[PDB]
């Protein structure tokens, strides 16, 4: 039952890994399934080495240094559910080795050094679901071989050299759900590039070279999780998301934002988490009118000097608010935001706190007022926050710090007051 090196276990599963071997094991357990062959020095794969093993479900070839695979080495064994080839020296997609697996639901090609992706690749694999290509050398979205995969709901093209995505490049993946394009050279995206994926809930464009806002997402009806960050986008246009009412997540941070479209964040209603950071030129707090439900909001690095008087009327859902590092020169009622827990106002122009500013926040825990112009705190209400624990007043104009309702503070930061300096 147990070939010597391998650790024979459980019922079906076998573990030969770590360590460690060349070629295959002596003992053929013919009733075995779920083989782990990973983490060894295995130079090449001979044909028929996998013929001796039928019924097999999952196979792990990862962790090897593998230059080349025989086209018939996998024997065409029809029961293989998933194949992990990651972290190997494969210089190309072994499209010939992958033919005849109709049961394959998941493929790991990532961490290989792969440049060429043959046009006949992924043929017959229509049962395929989740595909890994990342930390490869790829310079272009492998369109045609990608079109043989109707059942694919998870694709990752990330950590590659891909600089441009042509229109209709994803056209034939009808079931796609998550697409990871992150960490590329991507500069331009075709207007129709995302045509074809009506099922995508998740788009990752982060850590790319983009210039203009990716309107290609206008073709994504089911989109929920969205990011494009550490890009060069200078502009978020009107009705940017208008075709995407199901977005619950948007990370746009670290983009040299300049103008933001008034109509851009309006009427979203599904939006939960919104992250903006490093937009140095944006002067006006976005119009969120229509977007009444937000758990978490972030505006950082802007020139915004003020906040909408009405902001907390409709925001009743909001747990976490970060306005740190802006130009904000004054404050406004935070009552009505009662769901609030973490509030970050540090590095602003705020000179005051008032009796009613924080009035009625039961949930407030962290409160960051450090690095501001604060001198006095009006009619001293922190009294109303029973939850308050971390409080940072460091570096302001304060000569006196009001104490009431400060019971149970674990951390309190008083430093740099008053400074003076001046």
């Amino acid at each position: 039952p147990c070939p010597a090196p391998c650790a024979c276990d459980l019922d079906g599963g076998a573990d030969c890994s770590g360590k460690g071997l060349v070629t295959v094991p002596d003992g053929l357990s013919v009733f075995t399934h779920s083989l782990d062959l990973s983490m060894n020095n295995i130079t090449k794969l001979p044909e028929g080495a996998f013929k001796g093993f039928p019924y097999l479900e999952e196979l792990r070839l990862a962790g090897n240094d593998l230059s080349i695979i025989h086209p018939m080495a996998l024997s065409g064994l029809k029961e293989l559910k998933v194949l992990t080839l990651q972290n190997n020296q494969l210089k190309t997609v072994p499209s010939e080795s992958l033919k005849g697996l109709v049961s394959l639901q998941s493929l790991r090609l990532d961490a290989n050094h792969i440049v060429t992706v043959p046009e006949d690749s992924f043929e017959g694999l229509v049962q395929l679901r989740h595909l890994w290509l990342d930390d490869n050398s790829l310079t272009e979205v492998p369109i045609r071989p990608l079109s043989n995969l109707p059942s694919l709901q998870a694709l990752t093209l990330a950590l590659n050299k891909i600089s441009h995505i042509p229109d209709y490049a994803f056209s034939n993946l009808s079931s796609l759900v998550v697409l990871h394009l992150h960490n590329n050279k991507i500069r331009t995206l075709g207007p129709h590039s995302f045509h074809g994926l009506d099922n995508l809930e998740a788009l990752d464009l982060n850590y790319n070279n983009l210039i203009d806002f990716p309107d290609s997402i206008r073709s994504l009806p089911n989109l929920k999780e969205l990011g494009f960050h550490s890009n060069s986008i200078t502009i978020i246009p009107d009705g940017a998301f208008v075709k995407n009412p199901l977005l619950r997540t948007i990370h746009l941070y670290d983009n040299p934002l300049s103008f933001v479209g008034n109509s851009a964040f309006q009427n979203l209603s599904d939006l939960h988490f919104l992250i903006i950071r490093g937009a140095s030129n944006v002067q006006w707090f976005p119009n969120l009118t229509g977007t009444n439900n937000l758990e978490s909001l972030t505006l950082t690095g802007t020139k915004i000097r003020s906040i909408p008087i009405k902001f907390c009327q409709e925001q009743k859902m909001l747990r976490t608010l970060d306005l740190s590092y802006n130009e904000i020169s004054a404050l406004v009622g935070f009552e009505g935001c009662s769901s609030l827990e973490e509030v970050y106002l540090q590095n602003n122009q705020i000179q005051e706190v008032q009796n009613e500013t924080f009035q009625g926040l039961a949930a407030l825990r962290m409160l960051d007022l450090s690095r501001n112009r604060i001198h006095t705190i009006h009619k001293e209400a922190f009294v109303t926050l029973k939850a308050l624990t971390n409080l940072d007043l460091s570096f302001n104009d304060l000569t006196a710090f009001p104490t009431a309702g400060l019971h149970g503070l674990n951390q309190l930061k008083l430093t740099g007051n008053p400074n003076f300096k001046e």
Binding site: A62, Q86, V177
Partner: protein, 103 residues
């Protein structure tokens, strides 16, 4: 440190292994480990700098592809898209012989 050989590029018994040999991921919680293909219920993630492999926010998942997409559900439940439910939602009918949700 001196003569720490095993599997990882810089290893110190002060807080476990750091900076793994490429391309492998780090584990946490006593404290830190280096391996390929993070175990259940972690998901393997990759960056240029950090190979940090994380836990999914998807309930009761053995193997995740991402934050919100699950590839292999836990023994009890049915998998519809990336998310795991006890009762296959309709929506679409359940399959049989294995736990999956087919439309």
């Amino acid at each position: 440190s001196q003569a720490c050989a095993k599997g990882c590029e810089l290893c110190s018994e002060v807080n476990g292994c750091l900076k793994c040999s490429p391309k492998l991921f780090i584990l946490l919680e006593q404290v830190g480990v280096c391996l390929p293909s993070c175990p259940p219920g972690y998901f393997d993630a990759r960056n240029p700098d950090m190979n940090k492999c994380i836990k999914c926010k998807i309930e009761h998942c053995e193997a995740c592809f991402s934050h919100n997409f699950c590839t292999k559900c836990k023994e009890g439940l049915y998998l519809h898209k990336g998310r795991c439910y006890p009762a296959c939602p309709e929506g679409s009918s359940a399959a049989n012989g294995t736990m999956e949700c087919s439309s």
